[PDB]
């Protein structure tokens, strides 16, 4: 119920450690994700060291109350974690052992500049206040950090789960503080995004382009306009995707380029028909023959330039 | 335990300051948002002066029980805040330092009259419970008011976070109760809205307008009606994100004007065809030539007038 | 604590009053509806006044576990309300003043007929638990009943807020009549709904009607059928901002009438083309010239009749 | 706080009853519905004895935690009910008048074979356990079962609310239990479903059929294909209805029939055009004339057969 | 209160059994499902005994709090289960029976690689908190396991519910802890999927394929492009009821193949028209005649190959 007293001036060190169990429900628009894991703490307290020979036992057990557990809080959580203690043990020399299970929802920003092929890093922070006149510092136990082989996040791949051993210390509300950082690195599985999204747009665009090999005005108008309507519907079907961003991403630029191409195609069809009506078939034929080759080459060049810009 | 007597015959002033940590879940339908922040208080009570040199200068850590803590309640909260005491400290002169941490849901109105380019303001209200013997008033501490640099809202950029005073006896209640006000000014990042919404709408409108350079009735009818269908689909896509509001905004006026323009274009096409059939081609040609320049100028003038009306 | 003892067989009257704050969160399909508001009691406590003296004329402020607080329950709440007392003032004489802030999910019937121009009435029912002493009666307190002039019920303008003691009985008791009924009459602001829904529908219908000034079968077919498709898409858009109503409605009647008009227009166009093919141009011209005038007049007459029928 | 001392070897019995207040949120996706109601129980215990000799009283309330109460639990519920004791009393002979209000969400299967015109039955199950050596069985008090005139469910009609007097004892987990059954019979209101769903589809089908009075191939193709697209869009709009079911429903069969009719119409139009091209106009005219009368008759016969098959 | 003495050679063995009552709310995006079932335990403790002699008529005894209870914790469960003790019984010889009732949420992987015709498996994991003095391992009781006949899942049928023993020393910790696996095998009822999904899409494709029996370019382009739009709308309808799957499934392959077929059909129509324009009708006729037979055969072959690749 009382913090240990310092011998001369030394602070107290607490050894932490987090062991993941499962990550799920990674919301894109809300920029949150849920998690449940094991939390382990250990600290040394000489005031409760007992006699092993006299008592005949090596390690004594206890109960969650009536003993000094340091407070540990999470910075970026919407609500306090739901907790239940699993074990408390005391070593002969005084060091304490602890274990608990918790579940919480974390807040972390995301970067969507390369949304189909992006990589993200999620941060978890642990913080402890300088209680009483004893300074409290945090340490990382490298043997108590890990994850289960059954930890699966849908559509994501897990690369590493480490902790920055060196903490960050500063003064907040006229009191010293220490903050620990846990980093989880993930990479998106982009294979499914190709056949379900990318290729149908190309097919519809080529269907639009196929109108340069024709002369009838009504057929060309029907083709181009119905293809544009189909593109709008596909954009509606795709909109279940990244939220509004302060920057320009890859997919947004591609979609805008597609809209521009549709507008230019409509302009070309109108120009060709207007020239044909004015009894100048040669100019219309030259224009359509030029456009036949001009359109795909410009599309490929613009796509290459965009890929250079966003990945170079 | 007991209220501090007014031996000095002075009002019991406090020093209140809120330090933010992060804000999240700014709902539009329910007109509310969540918060997670500290709360620091400081008041003078000479009943527990601690001049002697018993223990260090930080003569402190009285438990939350067996001590008089002024009770502070929020006003515009859906549910009572959750509280957890962090520090309780006493200076030898007589002032007592106190701190907490809380999470709550705050209700505050929003005004989407300029939805793409609007700025909002969020209010937090503070009230102290009076005491029969003495009097309590509020005050703000400039140093203790601030926010972390890690605060973020999805789509909003924070500008300022200040505190102002509001005189007492709010509403019909007049039990000498003073209240405080906290304002968080925010803006909306409106860059991404341009290439996502505005430009495709103009492209579709221009595609529809291209019908004035033709004389085929069937092609013109197909162009105009199919572009109207595309306009309706894009309206569905736009409304998917825009929160519902029971009043008139900027985007609603723009959409209504677009519908009106489509109706007028259909009327013009019908008039041109009917005049042409009656063996009066000169009048039809003159009408379409006039409309070619009439439509964009009127559209630009209407947009300018609307912009001046809503933003001035 | 204990309830006040009988004095001269005088029943205990409780003057109640609700001070509205917020009316928001219209959840589900217009069945559940959240309320945040204050709540005021005033029951005399004669022959038990605490420290009554002119030397102690200062207003007495007490704690909830210090005086007898009557128990009041809401009849139609999904779950028991979350009580939160703001402050308690006890006069030296035999009277008390109570004020608390609550939040509950209230269930009330909503009628959506006359959906754009409807008025709603919300009822909340109050009963008070009886004790072994004399019967506790309920009465209205006119002074404390009212709003704060700044209720954030968006889209609705509040007309009045009154209360009546309606005699009722549910299961079994001598009186059981101690029930209060507070009614909050509200009305909807329908101005935005006109340009949001009504006018585009008429524009589309007129665009469909433009086919009577033509003689091209292909043009008429394209016009009418594509306009029908646009009408279906606009209906899909309209159904989003509207709850599920399992009963007839003004808007539903209008939509059905529009569908019938489209069907009749298709029939007329087919008949005209068939006659023209069978070489009866005079009959075809007479039919179309009659329809040009017949359609809008019947539309207006049906609309007038429907409005008169639905709106008394 | 112990079970009653058995005055004999007879099994202790408890008679109960449920009084409904409101039924709402009859979800069909998860086959659930919410409800709140009064629960009334009564038993006998010689531990409590009144004092008619000591001038008597008539109510003499108590508090729930002070007396033994049998544990009543519901079988098919989401979680434990939210029960707050409203009134508990006693009598000179020693009968306890228990009355609590509870809210819960119930699980019950639904049958959707006649979805537009279907009637269902909902079940609530009560259960008790054999405590100590004293066996406990349940009884039904017909005076405490019923619903008030204010019980309304949106879009449904209430028929009856009864309880089977005879329980169904069984041995589970080496113990004997008794179960009570409460049934609530409801019937759907179907009038609003006709002009909202049934008739527009018939109008679209007739618009598709009107293509047998023409000879132009392009107009027929446009009519049939655009009507098919409109039917698909209407199905998209209507899809907010009954979920996936193991069996086959009425509306699903009707929709499949409509799809078959559309396919047959396309085949007929193509065959007629192919015959017309091949310089055999007489056969094409005969086929069209036959189909004109063959389509509606087959549609009517199929509808009659389906009606006899499902509702007969 | 105290752990059992380690007298026997074998560690303490508990007999666990789960009796399902019902399951519900199977969410697929988060891959969770809630449960409601029993929990029956048993073990032998020789510390206390009840001799049949000396008024040993009482075979069974009840200890609410004055007895040692092994505690069971769930692993793949989002929040701690809500359990309430039902009954505790003690045999005269020493064997102790124990029962509860719980309800919680479960996290389990899902595999939608055969979405219409897939079978899943739901897991529940149980662990025991080791005691210092003695040792505990789990065991299964086949007569304490099972499910009630009133269990139901909307769209599934239950095959079996069995249990097995998982190896000790799970995860990184090796503190002689054992785990229990409860297997629930279900299958998806797919009868309603055929006439709701598969047949309409085939009908639309067959309608589109009729363009090979015509020579009119306008009719061909109208048919193909409008059927493409209809396919996109039907894809929206199909996806509406499908949870998001960030991988490649059977239905996605089918849809992509349909898109490819539409693109090839457009190319063929364009080639036929272009060849006909240059006065080479024999080659165009040969091409269309070949395509008439080529398309269905290739479609069937691709379908067979996909079926063998995914279900073999
Ligand atoms: C804002 C204003 C945008 C207005 C929206 C409608 C744009 C339609 C553009 C006009 C259609 C094509 C014009 C046309 O047929 O011109 C043919 C005419 C040739 O006829 P002569 O024999 O020389 O006489 O001139 C041309 O060839 C013009 C070719 C390029 C014109 C189009 C360039 C872009 C138009 C403005 C886009 C604004 C964004
Ligand atoms: C409401 C119902 C609206 C139906 C759609 C109206 C369509 C108008 C077409 C009429 C038309 O083509 O008239 C051409 C007509 C032919 O004149 P002659 O007698 O040949 O000389 O010319 C005119 O009248 C000149 C143009 C005036 C058109 C004004 C239309 C206004 C419509 C307002 C609708 C509200
Ligand atoms: C505002 C930009 C769009 C409108 C531009 C004004 C239209 C000019 C115009 O009508 O010129 C027509 C004139 C020839 O048509 P007639 O007068 O019949 O010979 O020239 C054109 O076609 C202009 C083409 C370029 C238009 C660009 C848009
Ligand atoms: C249900 C609605 C059924 C149709 C109601 C309207 C009928 C209009 C045409 C009435 C007869 C008529 O005018 O005959 C014209 C002419 C033939 O008469 P002659 O001898 O050539 O002169 O008939 C037509 O123009 C036929 C028009 C076909 C359209 C009607 C069919 C619509 C599709 C079938 C609907 C079946 C509903 C059951
Ligand atoms: C041009 C056509 C489109 C605009 C139609 C609406 C015009 C303005 C509607 C004015 C509504 C109004 O007066 O207030 C609402 C008023 C109040 O309802 P009660 O109290 O029952 O009315 C009795 C005393 N009047 O309701 C009405 O009168 C509604 C009138 C509906 C008119 C037709 C609207 C639909 C047209 C399509
Ligand atoms: C459903 C009834 C469908 C029409 C059956 C009668 C019919 O074939 O009418 C056609 C009839 C005779 O023309 P032939 O086919 O050359 O003989 O002409 C018409 O279209 C008459 C009008 C029929 C209206 C049908 C309304 C339903
Ligand atoms: C599954 C595979 C089929 C994929 C989709 C195929 C659609 C093609 C349907 C037939 C188009 C029209 C054929 C045509 O013009 O035939 C006319 C031709 C007339 O000339 P003859 O003297 O017979 O030489 O033959 C006929 O009359 C054919 C009559 C029956 C044709 C329709 C049969 C049903 C089609 C089966 C579709 C699959 C089920
Ligand atoms: C991946 C892209 C796949 C599509 C690329 C084109 C494949 C389809 C063309 C197959 C036939 C080509 C030659 C042929 O027989 O065409 C005849 C004729 C000329 O040949 P002669 O020498 O006269 O004989 O050509 C045509 O008819 C041309 C038709 C073009 C249709 C394809 C247009 C595709 C649209 C642009 C796609 C760009 C992809 C990058
Ligand atoms: C597989 C079923 C659909 C394809 C059937 C094979 C194609 C038959 C065919 O081409 O027959 C055409 C032939 C006449 O056309 P020409 O070759 O010009 O003589 O006969 C037909 O039209 C038969 C069509 C029957 C289709 C039934 C499906």
From Swiss-Prot, chains A, B, C, D, E:
Lineage: Bacteria, Bacillati, Cyanobacteriota, Cyanophyceae, Gloeobacterales
Ranges facing Cytoplasmic side: 213-215, 278-280
Entry keyword Transmembrane helix: yes
Domain notes: Consists of an N-terminal ligand-binding domain that encloses a wide aqueous vestibule and a transmembrane domain that forms a narrow channel.
Substitution effect: residue 198 to Y: Marked gain of function, with a ten-fold shift of the proton dose-response curve towards lower concentrations
Predominant cellular place of this UniProt entry's protein: membrane
Protein name listed in UniProt: Proton-gated ion channel
Misc note: The homologous nature of GLIC to eukaryotic nicotinic acetylcholine receptors and other eukaryotic pentameric ligand-gated ion channels, and its sensitivity to general anesthetics, define GLIC as a structural and functional model of signal transduction in the nervous system, also relevant for exploring the molecular basis of anesthetic action.
UniProt function note: Cationic channel with similar permeabilities for Na(+) and K(+), that is activated by an increase of the proton concentration on the extracellular side. Displays no permeability for chloride ions. Shows slow kinetics of activation, no desensitization and a single channel conductance of 8 pS. Might contribute to adaptation to external pH change.
Substitution effect: residue 226 to A: Increases the binding affinity of TBA
Family under the similarity heading: Belongs to the ligand-gated ion channel (TC 1.A.9) family.
A cellular-component GO term for this protein: plasma membrane
InterPro entries named in the record: GABAA/Glycine_rcpt (IPR006028), Neur_chan_lig-bd (IPR006202), Neur_chan_lig-bd_sf (IPR036734), Neur_channel (IPR006201), Neuro-gated_channel_TM_sf (IPR036719), Neuro_actylchol_rec (IPR038050)
Protein's gene: glvI
Effect of residue 238 to M: Displays an increased sensitivity to propofol but not to desflurane
């Amino acid at each position: 119920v009382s913090p240990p007293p310092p011998i001369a001036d030394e602070p107290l060190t607490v050894n932490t450690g987090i062991y993941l169990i499962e990550c799920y429900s990674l919301d894109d628009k809300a920029e949150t994700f849920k998690v449940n894991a094991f939390l382990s703490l250990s600290w040394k307290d000489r005031r409760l060291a007992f006699d092993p020979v006299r008592s005949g036992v090596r390690v004594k057990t206890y109960e969650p109350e009536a003993i000094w557990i340091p407070e540990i809080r999470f910075v970026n959580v919407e609500n306090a974690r739901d907790a239940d203690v699993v074990d408390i043990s005391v070593s002969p020399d005084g060091t304490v052992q602890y274990l608990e299970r918790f579940s919480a929802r974390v807040l972390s920003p995301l970067d969507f500049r390369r949304y189909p092929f992006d990589s993200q890093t999620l941060h978890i922070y642990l913080i402890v206040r300088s209680v009483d006149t004893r300074n409290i510092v945090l340490a990382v136990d490298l043997e108590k950090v890990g994850k289960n082989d059954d930890v699966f996040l849908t559509g994501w791949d897990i690369e590493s789960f480490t902790a920055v051993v060196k903490p960050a210390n500063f003064a907040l509300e006229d009191r010293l503080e220490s903050k620990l950082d846990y980093q989880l690195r993930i990479s998106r599985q982009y294979f499914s995004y190709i056949p379900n999204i990318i290729l149908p747009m190309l097919f519809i665009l080529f269907i639009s382009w196929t109108a340069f090999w024709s002369t009838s005005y009504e057929a060309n108008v029907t083709l181009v306009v119905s293809t544009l309507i189909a593109h709008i519907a596909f954009n509606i079907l795709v909109e279940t995707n990244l939220p509004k961003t302060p920057y320009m991403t890859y997919t947004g630029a591609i979609i805008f380029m597609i809209y521009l191409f549709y507008f230019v195609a409509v302009i070309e069809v109108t120009v060709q028909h207007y020239l044909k009506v004015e009894s100048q078939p040669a100019r219309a034929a030259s224009i359509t023959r030029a456009s036949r080759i001009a359109f795909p080459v410009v599309f490929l060049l613009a796509n290459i330039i965009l890929a250079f810009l966003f990945f170079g």
